[PDB]
Amino acid sequence: VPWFPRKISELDKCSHRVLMYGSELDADHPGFKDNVYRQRRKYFVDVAMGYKYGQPIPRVEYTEEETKTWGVVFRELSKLYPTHACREYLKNFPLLTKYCGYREDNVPQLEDVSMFLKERSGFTVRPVAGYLSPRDFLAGLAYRVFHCTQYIRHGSDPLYTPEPDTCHELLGHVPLLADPKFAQFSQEIGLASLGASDEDVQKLATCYFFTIEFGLCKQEGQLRAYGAGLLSSIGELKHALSDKACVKAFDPKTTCLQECLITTFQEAYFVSESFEEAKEKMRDFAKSITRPFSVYFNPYTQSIEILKDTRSIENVVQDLRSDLNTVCDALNKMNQYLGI
Amino acid sequence: VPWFPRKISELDKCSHRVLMYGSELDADHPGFKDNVYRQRRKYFVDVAMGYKYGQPIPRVEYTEEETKTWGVVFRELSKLYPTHACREYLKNFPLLTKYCGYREDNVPQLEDVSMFLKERSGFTVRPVAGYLSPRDFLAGLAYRVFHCTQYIRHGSDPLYTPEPDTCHELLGHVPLLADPKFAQFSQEIGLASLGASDEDVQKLATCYFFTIEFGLCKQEGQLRAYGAGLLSSIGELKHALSDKACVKAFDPKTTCLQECLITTFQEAYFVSESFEEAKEKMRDFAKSITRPFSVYFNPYTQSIEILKDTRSIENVVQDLRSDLNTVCDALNKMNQYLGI
Amino acid sequence: VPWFPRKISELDKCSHRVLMYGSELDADHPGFKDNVYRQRRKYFVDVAMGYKYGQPIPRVEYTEEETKTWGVVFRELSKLYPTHACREYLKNFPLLTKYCGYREDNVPQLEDVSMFLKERSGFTVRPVAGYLSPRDFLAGLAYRVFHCTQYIRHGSDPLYTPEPDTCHELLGHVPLLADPKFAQFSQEIGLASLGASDEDVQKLATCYFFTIEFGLCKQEGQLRAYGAGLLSSIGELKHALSDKACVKAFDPKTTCLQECLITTFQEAYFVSESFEEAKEKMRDFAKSITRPFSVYFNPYTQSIEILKDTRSIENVVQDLRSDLNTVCDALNKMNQYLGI
Amino acid sequence: VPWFPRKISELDKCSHRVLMYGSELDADHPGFKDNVYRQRRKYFVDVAMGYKYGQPIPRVEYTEEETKTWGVVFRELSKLYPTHACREYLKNFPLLTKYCGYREDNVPQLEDVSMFLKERSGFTVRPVAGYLSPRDFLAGLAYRVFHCTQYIRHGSDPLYTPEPDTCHELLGHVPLLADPKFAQFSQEIGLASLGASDEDVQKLATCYFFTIEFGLCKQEGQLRAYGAGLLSSIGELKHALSDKACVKAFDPKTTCLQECLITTFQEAYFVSESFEEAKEKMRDFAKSITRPFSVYFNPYTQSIEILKDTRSIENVVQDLRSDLNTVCDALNKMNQYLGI
Ligand SMILES: [Fe+3]
Ligand SMILES: [Fe+3]
Ligand SMILES: [Fe+3]
Ligand SMILES: [Fe+3]
């Protein structure tokens, strides 16, 4: 089977297997014919190729124009969250405004964001010179790690970006990784894809595209948005909720066959009910991917284990019994401190 | 109830509540009438009062005499472990010789030891200016943290020590924290004592004294030693394995009432069978300690949670079901990829 | 809430709350203008109104014409099972031919059938003077009891029946209650409907109509039939597997709104995958029926218990722990008798 | 391995493998030189050799002298229960007085007793021509079946009995089988001994002798009696709570090596805390009996299953999951119909 990391320190081979670099601006890229930008965006590549597990992420000092771009996006995008975004996004945004520094005059740093996430759900972030393969991104979601970029848009226009700058992974992805259920959902998508055939990693990356990127949920009646591609794009957060687009339920058996459009809107946005419903649908879709073992994530050691014999399975069951014996005692305490 | 830390960040208020300091050494201390020694015991206190959660532990460079003392103790203890120590100590010592640097001509560092432990059982190490209360030392084992000292004996005689030093916590305690079962045992002793009355913290500290400090086990027809007080002391390791000491079974109801002797040999020694037997006996004894809630350790967030209502208990059960599903899938794979 | 039985002996109020009687042939009955027939349909009603929990079911001796009718139906319907019925029906029919007496010139008895079922899945059968309400028929599947009739068709026509008789509940229902997973499915449908509002018992009875009466399954490619309404009717079993019938998918949120046709074919024939996934769909749908408690079936006592406080839930968890210890020991034995 | 029954209907080979008969009065029998008595023991033997699984137990009509003897024992023994018996005996005796007929001038019948037990704990009773081997008596507790006698003492001095008449199994054994936890304890002792070597059946029968026959418990302070040998004997129920006998703690590793006296007060009466504590000690001791498989009792089918591969263990785990869903739903109901 193909190689996957078996401990969170071996994840540095994946984090550094970058296909294309974030300094390679394309032809249609505003700033492809610039001189000062390219140097700025080449600084970030070298700052990100110097990360190593265990060392705090260095702080980047954003200039005066970058800060204005961040503020423009923040201002123009936060005045339509209250009526378009889901509930678990609104219950988490103020905490980010309070502890990490989300304000029009400041650009959050990855150290504060990573220390804020690490205490709420367990996730952490690490910087990447952009565009690592989907196998190596899903293999990082298995350890509860998220690969971020640090650069910002071109001040040319602050509302168009053919790529994931750092304003897409702070306003789209982070406010919703601080939720335990979304964290469990993401990590399970990631664990399902460890050592799988290149033909199943594509189905999983497609399900992730249509769930954790362009997803919609209806939780009290009318539906809302919980995908990053929406929650970070003004032009597409409106279209998706205005009744001019197709919306059909989520089904991983047919949803894994779709065109992941990059520049234009989507033919159809898939809707779901709750992170638990989608988590169950995806855990059922999984186990339909051929693999000759099972994997178990150990969160004390932070390492993956291959259940393929009976000694391993016996360890897992023995550790389940000790967690059942805690419930069976919390309940006794409630009883005695009430009437039986 | 008494204050306890509810997240591994708040453990700095406990790690720094030191009763007496490692510089304020007793009068009976060889070196109480010295001038150069008493000035390095202050460098160590200063480096230990400067630790903060999240920063790698700085490295200490040991002089030529300190190194020779460490080597003397190492070479004098190494020729007893093969026939006196337990089985797990023996299976873990060579790995320490290979990865952390256990050998004459250098003293292991706490950074290498902490990174070696963190990958095997989950424990980590942090330096302390000595002698913090028992409540604050047990509240640190709840989070899987061990409080170590960094100084070394007085070169006068590398065989007598009335106190802990960096040779009692590298040769006595560490080689056996790298075992998952000893790690669960220690952490459960620690979790039982969170917010308990000062009269129960004493019973728990006594059980810990007679189990994890001066303990004996019989794995084959003959018994061995798995306590640090033994595995770090030549005079007492080859006295408890001899027909001149009393040895009765372990019973947390009658052993929590006994004298913890500090300078002389213990009368009784409380043999046991296995870390699992002692873990079960302690979990039975540990439901007597009066407390109006239960605690649940969350290892992703690394935080303690109070089970005292039904929403918390329902969360815990929902997380148990997902771990039962993993076993139920591992077994199906093990079947289909075999004969039913 | 509405009254439901809380022990298998109180089920005699439900078993004897018969709406219409099996002696009341309607105008359209091919025996409505007969004289000797009715004098037998009265004997059956009388023998079925005399059953009492604990007494073996008396044996009915079928005349020469009744036996010939049974044989006609048997041999005319068994020559198209091999290519139409599911696999769990074919793996159970020979056992019935061997132990209970399925063969022409002999009509099986309910005592032999009930003793054959009681050893394979736990079900038993008891006779009923026909047509008890749906609430009272579903409250009997909660205890793993099935209400059967004992009469037979009118010999005039041996292949048309506007009602259930002893040939519909022996060739349609019984060969598939002897399966543990179909037994669990049926009992869960029954337990979901204890003390529920008359408006939910109708949705549950509809799901049961379209799953356990007219159901289809595709388990190896092409689909097959596992409903009694099909497996007991030549005309309809040979039409739902053809290409002149609309086969939709199973979804308890919509299928619970359908016309339960009694004399003509069904417009739609809902299809599924396996008793396990249909059981999961029904268990998720079955938590959207308003009820202020939960019920737990105790199979030693054979009684229902209301989980509505913490002492009951604590009992249930305490039994789960003892059932998990058995697995944790079976695995250890497999290990030691292999290599670890 | 030795033959054991794998379904509750195969238990008729064990129930009828009687070593000596209840009509064979020995020389020391106060009725050894009688003529009318023996002709009654013959009747009881003949009626007990005619039982067959599935048929209600016939009723025995006791004469006037027999009834007066039963009344003497009842009256002389019930006036010292309130201060000597455990609490779970006192909370069950009145129910027996109410439903089964415990009172002078009436001797309870085994049909009423068996139908009263079957609804409280699951046990049932069946008559035996006395003295079947210990292997065959323990293989009957695995299925929750108890083998009783139906005869009564000789009216001459109705206070001495060198054997278990029907007054020892109604006043000693039955009032405490109607408790769910004592029923679980007994059945586990019985299941531990299925297909074991004749040298372990002796240790298990000894533990049963010193726990379920001559046992004592301390549950609120001073200790009480819960064994049948005590609760049915005036002379020995007094020489157990008055301090003239040696009371030692219960330990299945040493108590399984003691001598069971038949006509003389036991030199030592073992004491315990609760049926759960003794159940745990026995499940621990029951791991050191050599056997190459595990057994699982299925209570719907009422049959034993050999866990020796992975398909069986997978079935068991799959049922555990469904039993855990019920708890996870009961807790949600409590939350909802309360405050979160
Ligand atoms: Fe994104
Ligand atoms: Fe120590
Ligand atoms: Fe039917
Ligand atoms: Fe007895």
Numbering used by the authors:
A (entry chain C), B (entry chain B), C (entry chain D), D (entry chain A): 151 to 490
Sentences from the paper on this structure:
Human tryptophan hydroxylase 2 (TPH2) is the rate-limiting enzyme in the synthesis of serotonin. TPH1 and TPH2, together with phenylalanine hydroxylase (PAH) and tyrosine hydroxylase (TH), form the family of pterin-dependent aromatic amino acid hydroxylases (AAAHs) that catalyze the hydroxylation of their respective aromatic amino acid substrates in a conserved mechanism, with molecular oxygen, tetrahydrobiopterin (BH4), and Fe2+ as cofactors. The members of AAAHs are all similarly composed of three domains in structures: an N-terminal regulatory domain for robustly modulating its activity, a catalytic domain for substrate binding, and a C-terminal domain for maintaining the oligomerization states. TPH2 is dominantly expressed in the central nervous system, where TPH1 is not expressed.
In our report, we determined the cryo-EM structure of human TPH2 in tetrameric conformation at 3.0 Å resolution. TPH2 is assembled by four protomers in a D2 symmetry, which is different from the previously deposited crystal structure in dimer form. There are 17 helices (labeled as H1–H17) and 4 β sheets in the TPH2 monomer, together with Fe2+ and imidazole as cofactors. The TPH2 monomer contains the catalytic domain and oligomeric domain but lacks the N-terminal regulatory domain, although full-length TPH2 was used for sample preparation. Thus, it is most likely that its N-terminal regulatory domain is too flexible to align the signal during 3D construction and thus is not seen in the final map. For the A/B interface, the C-terminal helix 17 of each chain forms a leucine zipper–like motif to maintain their interaction. The interface area expands to be approximately 1,838 Å2, and there are 27 amino acids participating in the interaction, located at not only helix 17 but also helix 11/15/16, as well as the antiparalleled β3/β4 sheets and some nearby loops. Besides, we also identified three hydrogen bonds mediated by E464, E468, and C478 in the A/B interface and a stable salt bridge between K157 and E269 in the A/C interface, which certainly contribute to the oligomeric assembly. Furthermore, we performed interaction analysis of the Fe2+ cofactor with the active site of the TPH2 cryo-EM structure. Figure 3D shows that catalytic iron binds to conserved H318, H323, and E363, which form a 2-His-1-carboxylate facial triad, in a similar manner to that observed in other AAAHs enzymes. Therefore, both the crystal structure and the cryo-EM structure might represent the activated state of TPH2, because their N-terminal is not bound closely to the catalytic domain whether it resulted from truncation or flexibility.
